[PDB]
Amino acid sequence: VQLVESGGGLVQPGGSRKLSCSASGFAFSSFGMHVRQAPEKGLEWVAYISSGSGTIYYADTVKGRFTISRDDPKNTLFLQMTSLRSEDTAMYYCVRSIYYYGSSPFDFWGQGTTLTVDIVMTQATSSVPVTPGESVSISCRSSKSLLHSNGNTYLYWFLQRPGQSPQLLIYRMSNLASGVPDRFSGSGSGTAFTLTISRLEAEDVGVYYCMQHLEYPLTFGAGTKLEL
Amino acid sequence: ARKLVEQLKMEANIDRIKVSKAAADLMAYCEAHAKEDPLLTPVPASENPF
Amino acid sequence: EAEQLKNQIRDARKACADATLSQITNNIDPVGRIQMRTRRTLRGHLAKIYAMHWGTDSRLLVSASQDGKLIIWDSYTTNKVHAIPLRSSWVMTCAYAPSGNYVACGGLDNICSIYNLKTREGNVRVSRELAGHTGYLSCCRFLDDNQIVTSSGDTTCALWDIETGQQTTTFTGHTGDVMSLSLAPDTRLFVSGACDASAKLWDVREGMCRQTFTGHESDINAICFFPNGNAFATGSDDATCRLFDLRADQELMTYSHDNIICGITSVSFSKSGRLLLAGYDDFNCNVWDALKADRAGVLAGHDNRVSCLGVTDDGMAVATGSWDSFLKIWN
Amino acid sequence: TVSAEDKAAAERSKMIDKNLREDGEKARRTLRLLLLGADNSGKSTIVKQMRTSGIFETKFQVDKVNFHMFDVGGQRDERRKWIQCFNDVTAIIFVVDSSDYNRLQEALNDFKSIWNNRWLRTISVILFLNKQDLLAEKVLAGKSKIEDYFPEFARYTTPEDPRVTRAKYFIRKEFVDISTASGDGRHICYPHFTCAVDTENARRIFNDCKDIILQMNLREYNLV
Amino acid sequence: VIILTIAGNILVIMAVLQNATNYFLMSLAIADMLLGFLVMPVSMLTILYGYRWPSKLCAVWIYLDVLFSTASIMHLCAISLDRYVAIQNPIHHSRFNSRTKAFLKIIAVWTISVGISMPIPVFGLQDDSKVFKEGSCLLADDNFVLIGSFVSFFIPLTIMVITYFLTIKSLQISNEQKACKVLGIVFFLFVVMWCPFFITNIMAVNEDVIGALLNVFVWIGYLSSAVNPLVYTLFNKTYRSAFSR
Ligand SMILES: CCN(CC)C(=O)[C@@H]1C=C2c3cccc4[nH]cc(c34)C[C@H]2N(C)C1
């Protein structure tokens, strides 16, 4: 499974550029597809396209000015950007998401392309000191309770190691993504959530982002760095 | 036919228990688990997932 | 020698028969009339449904049909999680793994095909195709994610190691096609019903027929274990359902009425075991007070015969499927 | 009241429903047939033009209509359990060897078994009597007698050698008698005579299928 | 005739036999039950009062009368045209029938029924003398009657003549002969119960003789709405049992 993003480089303000991500090794038609990171700041969600292109959402900032499209036979997803502004400078990530009972959205993220030109999620700690082999707890809070009448609580934890794309750790506050060790665990009440890392090791160290998928737009907290 | 008698010999000797005891055991299970059963006694609408 | 030991077995079971189950159960309050309504009807199968199985999570079920597709439904939201194309349109069985990772399908092609539901690349693909049965597969059931039992029309049942793809054990006692199979709750032993009008108890590890039960005039279409695991109920084209006790080795009870001429397509037990639910070729399912053999209710919402019947693991709901191509959930 | 994820699940289910409907639309185009012959029938070679242990399948087209023919190979004498599957087929193709008289009574019994099955009540049978050349040479030789195996042929009125016509019409008449004894008219038998090599058997299958479809349509429209 | 119409159609509506072709007969039985409760019983009051109309509902009553009468006639034309294709080439008719034609057919026979009778209240409700009373609430538009009764009866009649001639030609084995007798009765009754009114309607444009002729022939046309439930359904063994129960 691979997503490779192409396009980028300098655009003078007011210009237009197209970014494309190419999908290999997965049924691209089935997956709903999406996220950017400012040069040193947190993640923000740009757009979403459903399977079959039926449903499209954009964030308020980009809407009317960005357009997302998918070419299912060619296995490519495009973002058409016009009238680019200094805010738009970021690293744009192409993310895959599949929605059914028990699915894990946001599981795979592309490497991303540099561009140079509402539930409120808060992560209290900017940084935390850690000792190897020492348990660490990271906390997040929402403005509105993420518990829904179906019973799922839509909280997702992501890990961005240094120089790497984000990786899903936990989906829906308790379930653990495939390929993630058992050390990570997610405990949370509505409006108050935490991720517990026990027996911390090298390569567990990075910025942790908490995301809500209860309703659009999708919001990430600023997140907590971990430092050796 | 030689194979049949060997199986019939194995089935011939088995520990067997009185039908009254076996029926009493079945009744014990059914009365013990009667409250747990939703279909026997209709579950209230809030508890009902459907 | 064959006749002498057979008569000895008849004497042994007859010696135990001090009382009927009807005598012991006689002074018990009846369950009363039980009323269940089709809370949900699941539609999207364009041909006759043959088999269904509940998931252990109690929200997910799989169904098999003649249109050649296996569809997995989210019962609560009536949503199709997956729809799986099948190489052979002819399928008579389906199963759902206890871990929910896999489902199995069997049919007239004589092959048990196992599908990996949870995969990277986000599609349902064939984990294994299990060959070695010279007849059609009537029933398949999962021990673990590695081990699956099958029953076939070649008059033999087998245990398979899915990773190896070979039969670890073969069970060979029946003189006719084996229609149905039921794993025990403890899983260490299982029973099969067959067209020779006998039901055999099979110890899964040794591979031997521990006990054989004969009370049916005709073929036994359906078999189910009592929830305790010390008894089972068989369904037949005799139009009778009979409850058999493993330890006593004999039939405790028979469930029949003069109005009912039709054969029992499926059987299942409620969670307590007080209720025996059976599906018939009369397009309706009758609910029997299993302790007393009194009909407690009827479930009638199907245009054609009910092919399959299943009761949820938590016990909340009953799902029935029929040849009218609509399978309904009753609570 | 429905989360975003549940909404996406609903969209997925609707797309699945769409694809299942398209597949069913494909399925309706095909007409499905079941082939049954005990042995010595030459049933495999009935349809010359166009030719998996559990089931053997062939596809043939005449006049831009696609036909599927099913033979279930491995099974024993009692077919009652697998025959339940084939109750939606357009027609059953039953092949008999008219040449062999020892086989003929067993073939008549098997035809009765096919005819009187509960699930196959509404399904018409296209009956091919086979190896008519073998039968013709045998009757012309005269070494064997149908009169010996069947008493009725010894005194029978003929309705090509005349003895050959008499024998073939008697052989047909027994099968059509078993078919006619029901008399309901929901299902009827189309009897045909087939050489070992005949260019047109798909044409005959197609025209009896058209007759079957015509009759179901007349019943459906309440015309007759 | 009113009681017969209502009682005949409300016995066909319950009996629905859920075939794609049988549902179309419910749309025909709904165009006649409405004809038998809205339009027909009003005319009974007119008969009682001797052509005097008890005032702005006269144009509305004619609108319903033309709407349900044209909806009925083209229901039978669609049945006849569908019945021919199902008899000429039954193989190619079964392939192209996915229960969407029947819903596409109900659309067609109700778009033309409502499109032909749309001139009545849109141009004729403002004018109280064009489609309106001569003292008796008649249809006095002399140019709409000629062309509005031409595409409503005579085009469905020349379509039925060719369809009936072609169907009998292609049906020529008792079941085929039993069907040929059902088509003859159905075709003969439609002609003998609707054609008499439409030749008198158009030949007119002694007044007393023609005024009496058009009075009786109107009720012969209405009486065909009581028979349509029976001749199109009761030939089926299932419907006969359903009516008894
Ligand atoms: C006595 C007065 N009434 C009753 C309202 C009529 O003249 C009706 C006028 C009709 C009429 C005119 C012009 C075109 C048409 N198509 C179909 C009909 C039609 C129906 C036809 N109905 C039966 C009588």
Give CA separation, E144 vs C60, E140, E157, in Å: 64, 9, 18
CATH code of domain A2-117: 2.60.40.10
**Rounded distance between C-alpha atoms, residue D16 and residue D11, angstroms:** 9
Selection from A216, A214, A215, A217 nearest residue A147 by Cα: A214
D interface test, pick of C90, C175, C308 with most D CB neighbours within 10 Å: C90
Give CA separation, E113 vs A71, C3, D174, E193, in Å: 46, 82, 57, 19
* Pair of tokens at residue D173: 């008449």
Neighbours of E184 (CB within 10 A): 12
Q: Do the Cβ atoms of C120 and A98 come within 8 Å? A: no
Domain C1-330 is in which class?
Answer: mainly beta
| Phi and psi, residue D111, nearest 5° | -65, -40
Q: Is C123 on the interface with D (CB under 8 A)?
A: no
Q: Which residues of D touch C179 (CB under 8 A)?
A: 81
DSSP letter for A224, please: B
How open is the CA angle C143-C144-C146, to the nearest 5 degrees?
Answer: 115
* Minimum distance, in Å, between the CA of residue D138 and any CA atom of chain E: 35
**Rounded distance between C-alpha atoms, residue A45 and residue A58, angstroms:** 8
DSSP letter for B44, please: P
- Residues of D numbered 48-67 whose beta carbons fall under 8 angstroms of chain C's beta carbons: which are they? 52-55
Residue with CA nearest ligand 1 atom 10: E66
Q: Is C59 on the interface with A (CB under 8 A)?
A: yes
Residue A28, classified by CB atoms within 10 Å of its CB into exposed (0-12), middle (13-18) or buried (19+), is buried
Which atom of ligand 1 approaches the CA of E215 most closely?
1
Is there an atom of ligand 1 within 6 Å of E138 CB?
A: yes
Q: Residue C229 contacts by C-beta under 8 Å, 6 or more apart in sequence? A: C184, C185, C186
* Minimum distance, in Å, between the CA of residue D29 and any CA atom of chain A: 27
Q: Count structural domains, chain D.
A: 1
Range A81-110 burial, b when 16+ CB lie within 10 A, else e: beebeeebbbbbbbbbbbbbbebbbbbbbb
Q: Which residues of C touch B20 (CB under 8 A)?
A: 18-19, 24
**DSSP SS3 for D184:** coil
Q: Chains touching chain A at 3 or more Cβ pairs under 8 angstroms?
A: C, D
**Rounded distance between C-alpha atoms, residue C16 and residue C13, angstroms:** 5
- Cα E46 to middle of ligand 1, angstroms: 14
Selection from A25, A220, A44, A194 nearest residue A119 by Cα: A220
Candidate from E61, E66, E144, E145 with most ligand 1 atoms within 8 A of CB, to mutate:
E66
Residue A218, classified by CB atoms within 10 Å of its CB into exposed (0-12), middle (13-18) or buried (19+), is buried
Give a three-class secondary structure readout of chain C. CHHHHHHHHHHHHHHHCCCCHHHHHCCCCCCCCCCCCEEEEECCCCCCEEEEEECCCCCEEEEEECCCEEEEEECCCCEEEEEEECCCCCEEEEEECCCCCEEEEEECCCCEEEEECCCCCCCCEEEEEECCCCCCEEEEEECCCCEEEEEECCCCEEEEECCCCEEEEEECCCCCCEEEEEECCCCCEEEEEECCCCEEEEECCCCEEEEEECCCCCCEEEEEECCCCCEEEEEECCCCEEEEECCCCCEEEEECCCCCCCCEEEEEECCCCCEEEEEECCCCEEEEECCCCEEEEEECCCCCCEEEEEECCCCCCEEEEECCCCEEEEC
**Rounded distance between C-alpha atoms, residue D195 and residue C274, angstroms:** 63
C259 residue type, one letter: N
* Pair of tokens at residue A37: 């990171």
Nearest to C212 among B11, B25, B43 (CB): B11
A168 residue type, one letter: L
Is there an atom of ligand 1 within 6 Å of E71 CB?
A: no
Nearest to D218 among E98, E175, E232 (CB): E175
Q: Do the Cβ atoms of D217 and E86 come within 8 Å? A: yes
CA closest to C110 among chain D residues: D54
Candidate from E62, E114, E118 with most ligand 1 atoms within 8 A of CB, to mutate:
E62
**Rounded distance between C-alpha atoms, residue A36 and residue A81, angstroms:** 13
How open is the CA angle D46-D50-D56, to the nearest 5 degrees?
Answer: 75
**Rounded distance between C-alpha atoms, residue E127 and residue C10, angstroms:** 99
Size of interface A-D (CB pairs under 8 A): 40
Whether B and E touch (3+ CB pairs < 8 Å), yes or no: no
Range C277-314 burial, b when 16+ CB lie within 10 A, else e: bbbbbbbbbbbbbbbbbebbbebebbeebbbbbbbbee
- Cα E64 to middle of ligand 1, angstroms: 9
Whether B and D touch (3+ CB pairs < 8 Å), yes or no: no
Q: Which residues of D touch A96 (CB under 8 A)?
A: none
Q: Which residues of C touch A25 (CB under 8 A)?
A: 121
**Rounded distance between C-alpha atoms, residue A161 and residue A207, angstroms:** 7
Q: Are D44 and D81 in contact (CB under 8 A)?
A: no
Q: Do the Cβ atoms of D11 and A149 come within 8 Å? A: no
Is there an atom of ligand 1 within 6 Å of E58 CB?
A: no
Looking at residue E103, which CATH number applies to its domain? 1.20.1070.10
**Rounded distance between C-alpha atoms, residue E173 and residue E184, angstroms:** 17
Q: Which residues of E touch D67 (CB under 8 A)?
A: none
Q: Which residues of D touch A54 (CB under 8 A)?
A: 11
Is there an atom of ligand 1 within 6 Å of E42 CB?
A: no
* Pair of tokens at residue D128: 């091919």
Q: Do the Cβ atoms of C81 and A27 come within 8 Å? A: no
| Residue D168 host element (H or E) | helix D162-180
**Rounded distance between C-alpha atoms, residue E148 and residue E154, angstroms:** 10
Q: Do the Cβ atoms of B5 and C208 come within 8 Å? A: no
Q: Is D84 on the interface with C (CB under 8 A)?
A: no
**DSSP SS3 for D51:** coil
Find out whether E142 is annotated in a ligand binding site. Answer: no
Q: Do the Cβ atoms of A1 and C60 come within 8 Å? A: no
Q: Count structural domains, chain E.
A: 1
Q: Residue C176 contacts by C-beta under 8 Å, 6 or more apart in sequence? A: C155, C194, C195, C196, C197, C219
Residue A53, classified by CB atoms within 10 Å of its CB into exposed (0-12), middle (13-18) or buried (19+), is middle
- Residues of A numbered 66-125 whose beta carbons fall under 8 angstroms of chain D's beta carbons: which are they? 99-101, 103, 105
Selection from D125, D187, D218 nearest residue E175 by Cα: D218
The distance from CA C293 to its chain's CA centroid, rounded to whole angstroms, is 20
Q: Which residue's entry shows tokens 């946001």? A: A106
Q: Do the Cβ atoms of A51 and D15 come within 8 Å? A: yes
**Rounded distance between C-alpha atoms, residue A128 and residue A136, angstroms:** 8
DSSP letter for A199, please: S
| Sign of the Cα pseudo-torsion (C14, C15, C16, C20, in order) | positive
Looking at residue D16, which CATH number applies to its domain? 3.40.50.300
Resolution of the structure, angstroms: 3.1
Q: Which residue's entry shows tokens 């579950």? A: B43
Q: Do the Cβ atoms of C109 and D74 come within 8 Å? A: no
Q: Which residues of C touch D74 (CB under 8 A)?
A: 110, 134-135, 154
Find out whether E97 is annotated in a ligand binding site. Answer: no
| Residue E66 host element (H or E) | helix E58-88
CATH code of domain A121-226: 2.60.40.10
Q: Which residues of A touch D4 (CB under 8 A)?
A: 154, 213-216
Is there an atom of ligand 1 within 6 Å of E160 CB?
A: no
Q: Are C241 and C267 in contact (CB under 8 A)?
A: yes
Nearest to E179 among D209, D213, D224 (CB): D224
Selection from D42, D45, D57 nearest residue D199 by Cα: D45
Q: Do the Cβ atoms of A101 and C74 come within 8 Å? A: yes
Residue with CA nearest ligand 1 atom 14: E149
Q: Are D146 and D110 in contact (CB under 8 A)?
A: no
**Rounded distance between C-alpha atoms, residue E158 and residue E155, angstroms:** 5
* Minimum distance, in Å, between the CA of residue C124 and any CA atom of chain A: 11
| Residue D130 host element (H or E) | strand D124-130
β-pair type (D124-130, D91-97): parallel
Which fold does the domain B1-50 belong to in CATH?
G Protein Gi Gamma 2 (4.10.260)
| Phi and psi, residue A197, nearest 5° | -110, 120
Q: Do the Cβ atoms of D74 and C48 come within 8 Å? A: no
Give CA separation, A103 vs A19, C120, C124, in Å: 27, 11, 13
**Rounded distance between C-alpha atoms, residue C229 and residue C25, angstroms:** 19
Q: Do the first three CATH levels of A2-117 and A121-226 match, i.e. the same topology?
A: yes
**DSSP SS3 for D82:** coil
Q: Is E90 on the interface with D (CB under 8 A)?
A: yes
Q: Are A35 and A3 in contact (CB under 8 A)?
A: no
Is there an atom of ligand 1 within 6 Å of E193 CB?
A: no
